Design a protein around this ligand. Structure first.
Ligand SMILES: [Mn+2]
Ligand SMILES: [Zn+2]
Lengths: 340, 373
DNA sequence: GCCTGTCTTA
């Protein structure tokens, strides 16, 4: 794992905590700019290209039939077999969205991608607007279904008061099956998921999603639990089952990347409010087993070691894009790329 | 006594989503904003009053003026019929606030304020003006409601800090305040009018584009070209509702349009507004714009551009030098390299037109300039 | 037929 500094172009200010990166056919894109999109790039979606350790953000355009989704911080994202699902997140006005957006490549002409952003209506057991929650796709019996779990939201309209207008609570830990084909959602209460969970990691393989780490507001604990959630889809009657598995890491806001099929790396995050998770984990997947192994910690610089906060995203090609704030004279943020 | 949180009051009906506690003073401006290391980083310190509570404190402060104003209008001290309060809302950045020993790290601030503009009482089918703020633009009556150390251009923090205030303000728009003054309970109905916003902040909180846009007016949908060709016939068509609507149109793209067509459709409302404002103009800028135009006209009429289309840079520079010298000579007017208010005030006089006519050949153009002025 | 900080002074 080699760490490398990155320089940024004129629009470095766009990068903020909570951003997302999506990978289409090797090309990386950036979404979730700070502030509302400006005339320079009306979509808020950018070609995100690092050449010789220099990062350029170049505006990307939408098709004629697209939504112009608002920039979203800490949304739930996942990859669909190729398109990208974004659900929830905070808008520049601090509102939480309940909508679902789908990003796809509409046209790639002379290496210049046009995107299609389509809003998907959701009926049934729609999950309350959220941020910091997970969504993944499972495949069972030749069928595809979305699984969404966790996160936080504001208080319900009945209990919310202007003195604590911005206070947040964990969502009820109900698993949401979401059929994108029909636009419907069903909520499943499981006895094994008793507490709410936010900023956790989710790994999807076949008919299963594993839930790792995360932070629970009510207890103010980062639990060291690992949860397996299996979904079978026999005809029109789905079934969901959860199992606790010992050996779970305790981490919130960690970043996950895929290094090879059935092997993923977990880097970064927080072990305690004042402490950072400097170690790294390797997860190897079996059809019915998951293994979590300590790996060699990278050669962090002193700036990373002494930073209180760090944030980042998965670029896709086994490489993470990381960022930390700095003071003194100079830059607002300093960015690195960690390869695997 | 003089601070919010001292007197008791009631709202009928109770305000939506606002506490009924009356002993609230200074409250944290983040309004419980999440601060954990996982969340978005909170880099600002802010404090505020509860909007209703601050309205109570301000009213009790002006109690003596209200009673004296009723007396001066030949009304009774003990009368309690519904008073109406016209509250002017304001918000501005305060530029730099840093104290520094060079390597100056800037520190910007935002002040959210309100100004009781007038109080009336319904005595008949008549609204008697028992109070009217004598110096409405003074810093003396601009009651601070929320102070924050954050950039007015930092939209995420601006909306996180201000949204609870706006919510209390909304809630009060649908209720009547009962409060004891001089022993008599009185009732107060409020009218909030967000006029204390300069154009930049208007555009920011109402979803509009930045000031360099083609859509130059925050009252109508005109473009700069349209406004230049069509000079006088426009109407006040923008509104907070329309602007909310246009953001939704922009977001959903319901007629599957290209970005230029969509932008044309929504008249530049490309982000969701979050504060209802009442943009206006100050007496100063009317004068300033008129004077800028008259100054340019003076320079061009000295150069007889009505008669000669082309002119080099040197010819126009000598025209301006002639005009500046002649104003300094006959009108005692210093030349200025930058537009400003009192140059406008002193230049927009018929005397200056006689002066500049001393430099114009044809007197039909004298007549034209005299009539324009 | 540009956008948008930085800088310079008035
Ligand atoms: Mn200002
Ligand atoms: Zn207009």
């Amino acid at each position: 794992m080699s760490l490398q500094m990155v320089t940024v172009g004129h629009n470095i200010a766009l990068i903020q905590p909570g951003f997302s990166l999506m990978n289409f056919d090797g090309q990386v894109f950036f979404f979730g700019q700070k502030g509302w999109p400006k005339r320079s790039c009306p979509t808020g979606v950018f070609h995100f290209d690092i050449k010789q350790n220099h990062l350029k953000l170049k505006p990307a355009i939408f098709s004629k039939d697209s939504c112009y989704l608002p920039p979203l911080r800490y949304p739930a994202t996942c990859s669909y077999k190729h398109q990208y699902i974004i659900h929830g997140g905070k808008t520049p006005n601090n509102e939480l969205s309940d909508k679902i957006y789908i990003m796809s490549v509409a046209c790639k002409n002379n290496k210049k991608v046009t995107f299609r952003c389509t809003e998907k209506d959701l009926v049934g057991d729609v999950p309350e607007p959220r941020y910091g929650h997970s969504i993944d796709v499972v495949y069972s019996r030749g069928k595809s279904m979305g699984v969404l779990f966790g996160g936080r939201s504001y208080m319900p309209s009945t209990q919310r008061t202007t003195e604590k207008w911005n206070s947040v609570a964990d969502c009820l830990p109900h698993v949401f099956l979401i059929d994108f084909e029909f636009g419907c959602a069903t909520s499943y209460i499981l006895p094994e998921l008793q507490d709410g969970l936010s900023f956790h990691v989710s790994i999807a393989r076949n008919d299963t999603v594993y839930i790792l780490g995360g932070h629970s507001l009510a207890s103010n604990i980062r639990p060291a639990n690992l949860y397996r959630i299996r979904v079978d889809l026999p005809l029109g009657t789905p079934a969901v089952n959860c199992t606790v598995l010992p050996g779970g890491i305790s981490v919130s806001s960690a970043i996950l990347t895929q290094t090879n099929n059935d092997e993923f790396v977990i880097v970064g995050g927080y072990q305690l409010e004042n402490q950072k998770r400097m170690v790294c984990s390797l997860v190897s997947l079996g059809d019915n087993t998951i293994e979590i192994s300590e790996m060699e910690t990278p050669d962090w610089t002193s700036d990373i070691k002494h930073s209180k906060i760090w944030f980042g995203s998965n670029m896709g090609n086994g490489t993470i894009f990381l960022g930390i704030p700095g003071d003194n004279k100079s830059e607002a943020f300093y960015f690195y790329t960690l390869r695997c | 006594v003089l601070l919010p949180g001292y007197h008791p009051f009631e709202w009928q009906p109770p305000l939506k989503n606002v506490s009924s506690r009356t002993d609230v003073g200074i409250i944290d401006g983040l309004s419980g904003l999440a601060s954990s290391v996982d969340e978005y980083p909170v880099d600002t310190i802010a404090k505020r009053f509860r909007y209703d509570s601050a309205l109570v404190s301000a009213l009790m402060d002006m109690e003596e003026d209200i009673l004296e104003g009723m007396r001066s209008q030949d009304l009774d001290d003990y009368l309690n019929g519904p008073f109406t309060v016209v509250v002017k809302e304001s918000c501005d950045g305060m530029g730099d606030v840093s104290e520094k020993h060079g390597p100056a790290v800037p520190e910007k601030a935002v002040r959210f304020s309100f100004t009781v503009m007038r109080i009336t009482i319904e005595h008949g089918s008549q609204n008697v003006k028992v109070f009217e703020e004598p110096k409405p633009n003074s810093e003396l009556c601009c009651k601070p409601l929320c102070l924050m150390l954050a950039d007015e251009s930092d939209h995420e923090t601006l909306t996180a800090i201000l949204s609870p205030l706006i919510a209390e303000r909304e809630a009060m728009k649908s209720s009547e305040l009962t409060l004891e003054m001089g022993g008599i309970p009185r009732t107060f109905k409020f009218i909030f009018r967000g006029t204390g916003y300069d154009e930049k902040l208007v555009r920011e909180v109402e979803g509009l584009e930045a000031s360099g846009s083609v859509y130059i007016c925050t009252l109508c949908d005109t473009t700069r070209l349209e406004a230049s060709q069509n000079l006088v016939f426009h109407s006040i068509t923008r509104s907070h509702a329309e602007n909310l609507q246009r953001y939704e149109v922009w977001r959903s793209n319901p007629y599957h349009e290209s970005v230029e067509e969509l932008r044309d459709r929504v008249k530049g409302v490309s982000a969701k507004p979050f504060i209802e404002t009442v943009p206006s103009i100050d007496a100063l800028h009317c004068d300033i714009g008129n004077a800028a135009e008259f100054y340019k006209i003076f320079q061009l009429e000295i150069g007889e551009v009505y008669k000669h289309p082309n002119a080099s840079k040197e010819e126009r520079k000598r025209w301006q030098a002639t005009l500046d010298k002649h104003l300094r000579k006959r009108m005692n007017l210093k030349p200025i390299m930058r537009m400003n208010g009192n140059f406008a005030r002193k230049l927009m006089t018929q005397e200056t037109v006689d002066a500049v006519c001393e430099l114009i050949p044809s007197e039909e153009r004298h007549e034209a300039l005299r009539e324009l002025m």
